[PDB]
């Protein structure tokens, strides 16, 4: 009896992959400072983002199979090079460095004298600078060289731009949609009872860090434990905190900028003398707040590893500096902190057997992150003392392979892949394409 009929706009979608753009909230543009991070032409966010709750719907999510992460990872990388392209290349800095020990803490800073090319191509320039031990390597008085010269090339980041992370909403073009998991407790895998859709994801600050998730989103109720493959010790374990942990990272060296002239037209910013406290960079963590968090987290691991077992913490095993330390950016400078003091503990079933804690931090201006070869970025010196306060919202953890599986387990801070950092914010999101076209049988026919 019936007849086929074309319906346009039926609620049907399929899992797929597309190219997502950014959103800057249209305030970051007023923040100016000559293109801070991403935002230059970045899309103004809709003042009223739309979230539609889909009733009677259950969708299965996988955060580890999420494609939004891979795009974001490649975005930050592609974003990084484009910031370094118009800037000043430091290529003729590979000149021999004659260094000496600074006037305590085993001479971490080196005072280096070297020959340099002026605006004119005739006479050289005899000038001195100040580099950290991590930025230089001796070659055989004491003679040193740039640490990156044998490995790769080098370019200086522009002082105009800042590395300051600003909220970025990922949105989908016409024909696509983004699903949001509204459950309080979600490990990133399995069906989601309450699912809502949004045009743009929430505010996500692209904070690049290791061993500590900084400035992220807090969990709901109980703290969350996420891992791709849990029983497998080769896979990292992502943790999401409930209450934010106050962390202080400062540069207890009050510095000055030389702004030497290596023309024509180009000017390099050298590190002058340090006027102030003679100290190494340090990181503060409140003993009470970290412990309270640890006690709640250590109970969550026993929802898997069993109600009763011994869980011991220890600092990094070994590897590259990026893996073994906490790496991040504060005030333009790149800190590498020693987390060994926090991870020194041993816990009982429900308990573990002062007013402050500190963590020695090292500074490195010349960096190759993401295992990049051919391009090394020089972090320009900053006038005055840098102070910053951030939230610790999660960790990257690894489990030992030595077993003795039925006895006890030890966990250590992870590192390496930065995709895990983005999976922390993207676990509740995935991309699907909408299929509007549909057919249904009805009596209407036609004349």
């Amino acid at each position: 009896n019936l007849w086929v009929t074309v319906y346009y706009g039926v609620p049907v979608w399929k899992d797929a992959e597309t190219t997502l753009f950014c959103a800057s909230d249209a305030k970051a543009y007023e923040t100016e400072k000559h293109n801070v991070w991403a935002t230059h032409a970045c899309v103004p966010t809709d003042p009223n983002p739309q979230e539609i709750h889909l009733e009677n719907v259950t969708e299965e999510f996988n955060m580890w199979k999420n494609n939004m992460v891979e795009q974001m990872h490649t975005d930050i990388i592609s974003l990084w090079d484009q910031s370094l392209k118009p800037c000043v290349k430091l290529t003729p800095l590979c000149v021999t460095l004659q260094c000496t020990n600074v006037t305590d803490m085993r001479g971490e800073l080196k005072n280096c004298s070297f020959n340099m090319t002026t605006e004119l191509r005739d006479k050289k320039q005899k000038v001195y600078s100040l580099f950290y031990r991590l930025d230089v390597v001796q070659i055989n008085n004491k003679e040193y060289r740039l640490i990156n010269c044998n490995t790769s090339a080098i370019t200086q980041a522009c002082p105009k731009v800042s590395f300051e992370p600003i909220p970025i909403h990922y949105c989908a073009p016409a024909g696509f949609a983004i699903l949001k998991c509204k459950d309080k407790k979600f490990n990133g895998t399995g069906p989601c009872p309450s699912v809502s859709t949004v045009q743009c994801t929430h505010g996500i600050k692209p904070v690049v860090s290791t061993q500590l998730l900084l400035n992220g989103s807090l969990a709901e109720e109980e703290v969350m434990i996420r891992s791709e493959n849990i029983t497998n010790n080769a896979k990292n374990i992502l943790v999401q905190f409930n209450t934010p942990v106050q962390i202080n990272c400062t540069r207890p060296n009050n510095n000055t900028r030389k702004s030497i002239r290596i023309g024509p037209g180009q000017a390099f910013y050298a590190t002058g003398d340090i006027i102030g406290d003679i100290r190494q960079a340090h990181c503060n963590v409140s003993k009470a707040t970290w412990n309270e968090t640890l006690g709640k987290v250590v109970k969550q691991l026993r929802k898997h590893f069993g109600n009763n077992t011994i869980i011991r913490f220890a600092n990094s095993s070994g590897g590259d500096l990026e893996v073994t330390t906490h790496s991040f950016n504060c005030g333009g400078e790149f800190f590498y902190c020693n987390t060994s003091g926090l991870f020194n503990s041993t816990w009982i079933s429900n308990t573990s057997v002062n007013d402050s804690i500190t963590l020695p931090c090292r500074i490195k201006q010349i960096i190759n992150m993401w295992q990049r070869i051919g391009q090394a970025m020089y972090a320009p010196p900053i006038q005055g003392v840098i102070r910053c306060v951030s939230n610790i919202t999660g960790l990257i953890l690894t489990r030992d392979g030595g077993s003795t599986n039925s006895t006890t387990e030890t966990f250590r801070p992870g590192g390496g892949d930065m995709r895990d950092n983005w999976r922390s914010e993207l676990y509740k999101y995935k991309v699907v394409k909408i299929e509007p076209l549909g057919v249904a049988p009805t009596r209407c026919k036609r004349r």
Binding site: N1, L2, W3, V4, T5, V6, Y7, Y8, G9, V10, P11, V12, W13, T18, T19, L20, F21, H40, A41, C42, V43, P44, D46, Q50, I52, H53, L54, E55, N56, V57, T58, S78, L79, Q82, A172, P173, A174, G175, F176, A177, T197, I434, P436, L437, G438, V439, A440, P441, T442, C444, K445, R446
Partner: protein, 132 residues
């Protein structure tokens, strides 16, 4: 916006217009004022394939017996071999996601009946009926 995807097909016909609107349109008019070689292609590649995917749907709507959006009907008889069912078992008791699942085998077959059996044979039929 997709709210009835979990609901029955009968209830899903009421909010049909909302899906048509948002899916169909881009009206942000945001960005593209100041040029970039790098990222800009990325915000291009997405919306260019979007309008290509868009005109793709519009073609089927035109070449078939629709010539208009939302709902339109046709002279194609519903085959018994295609989801033999009860009328109340489809709209009232069944959902679109559940529905498209079964028709998956006959979907390409039905498409042929719309463009070939109708607008090729109907418009020619119309030309013969409009002469007299």
């Amino acid at each position: 916006f997709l709210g009835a995807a979990g609901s029955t097909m009968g209830a899903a016909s009421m909010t049909l217009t909302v899906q048509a609107r948002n899916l169909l349109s881009g009206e942000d008019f945001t960005i593209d004022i100041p040029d970039v070689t790098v990222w800009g292609i990325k915000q291009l590649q997405a919306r260019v394939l979007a309008v290509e995917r868009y005109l793709r749907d519009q073609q089927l709507l035109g070449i078939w017996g629709c010539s208009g959006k939302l709902i339109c009907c046709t002279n194609v008889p519903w085959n018994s071999s295609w989801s033999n069912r009860n009328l109340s078992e489809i709209w009232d008791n069944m959902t679109w996601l559940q529905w498209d699942k079964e028709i998956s085998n006959y979907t390409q077959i039905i498409y042929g009946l719309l463009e070939e059996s109708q607008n090729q044979q109907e418009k020619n039929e119309q030309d013969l009926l409009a002469l007299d």
